[PDB]
Design a protein around this ligand. Structure first.
Ligand code: A1R
Ligand code: ZN
Lengths: 289, 8
């Protein structure tokens, strides 16, 4: 969990502004939008990186390029790549970061409106964020379904296949015969209906409050739609914050006068924010339990 | 609703 600053530049003052806005609006709440940057510190191997064991196992299995592992047509022709990825990435093999535990502290102080995540690791929930406050915009392993007829399966029958040497005879539907897979959104599928429904409600809520709210976008390249449409859809008069090593998406393309950009690691941003809020003592208890 | 998961 140990962190350091990204460069010699200090971000403490920028982070201070965030704290002063929450101190001045004490009954207000924050919406978070987060991606794979917040789980890097957990040791999750990036399937697109040649430095990982995951990458080289997928190449050896003849995956044509990384993102095919999450492609419907590919999985139906050959499920082995996706099953080998699931074995390495399956929830419960990793532990939540300091940033993950900040979401849980915000919820404990009653200042979390929602977290929208494009990660499939389920580390927000593992850290104790409640079910009503999370939207897993790209699904998770906690449900499974038949890709052909939609019949529902418990996630254990898929999981038990990952323990076999070698992995073979993939799970097939007892009604229609097609492959059953986890409820992970693949490239070319629509996202779950709760995504569009909750953003509709949270977009209304944000407009009505203009207790002024805050939206903080953390560790995401804003390269995958429709997720990445959310920050352009934030009301002009609700203050946006970006904690990301690089300036991306609508914050690069259409900057706003009140946009605040913080180039910092998510874990280091967490530790600075908690310090500027005065919540060091309650944080330290969450971290030791 | 946004459409299917994709890039761009
Ligand atoms: N420690 C830390 N702190 C803050 N930001 C970070 C960190 N590490 C990486 N990042 C930033 O987080 C972003 C991560 O982008 P990316 O790897 O593309 O993942 P996503 O969450 O956006 O997307 C997932 C992708 N995974 C599978 C699909 O291939 C998607 O394209 C990127 O803009 C980085 O600058
Ligand atoms: Zn079926």
């Amino acid at each position: 969990m140990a962190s350091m600053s990204v460069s010699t530049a200090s971000t403490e003052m920028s982070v201070r502004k965030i704290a002063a806005h929450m101190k001045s609006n004490p009954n207000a709440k924050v919406i978070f939008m987060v991606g794979a940057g917040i789980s890097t510190s957990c040791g999750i191997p990036d399937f697109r990186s040649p430095g990982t064991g995951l990458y080289h196992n997928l190449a050896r299995l003849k995956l044509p390029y990384p993102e095919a592992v999450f492609d419907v047509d590919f999985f139906q022709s050959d499920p082995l790549p996706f099953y080998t990825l699931a074995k390495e990435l399956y929830p419960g093999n990793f532990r939540p970061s300091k940033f993950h535990y900040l979401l849980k502290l915000f919820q404990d102080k009653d200042v979390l409106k929602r977290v929208y995540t494009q990660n499939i690791d389920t580390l927000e929930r593992q850290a104790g964020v409640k079910d009503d406050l999370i939207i897993e915009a790209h699904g998770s392993f906690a449900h499974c379904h038949c890709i052909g007829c939609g019949k529902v399966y418990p996630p254990q029958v898929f999981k038990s296949k990952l323990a076999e040497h070698p992995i073979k005879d993939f799970v097939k539907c007892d009604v229609c015969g097609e492959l059953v897979k986890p409820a992970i959104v693949f490239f070319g599928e629509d996202l779950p209906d709760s995504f569009s429904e909750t953003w509709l409600n949270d977009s209304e809520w944000l407009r009505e409050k203009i207790q002024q709210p805050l939206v903080i976008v953390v560790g995401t390249s804003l390269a995958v739609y429709p997720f990445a449409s959310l920050p352009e859809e934030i009301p002009r008069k609700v203050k946006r914050v970006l904690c990301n090593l690089e300036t991306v998406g609508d914050f690069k393309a259409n900057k706003r006068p009140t946009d605040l950009i913080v180039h910092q690691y998510s874990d280091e941003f967490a530790e600075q924010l908690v310090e500027e809020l005065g919540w060091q003592e309650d944080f330290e208890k969450i971290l030791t339990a | 609703k946004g459409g299917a998961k994709r890039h761009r």
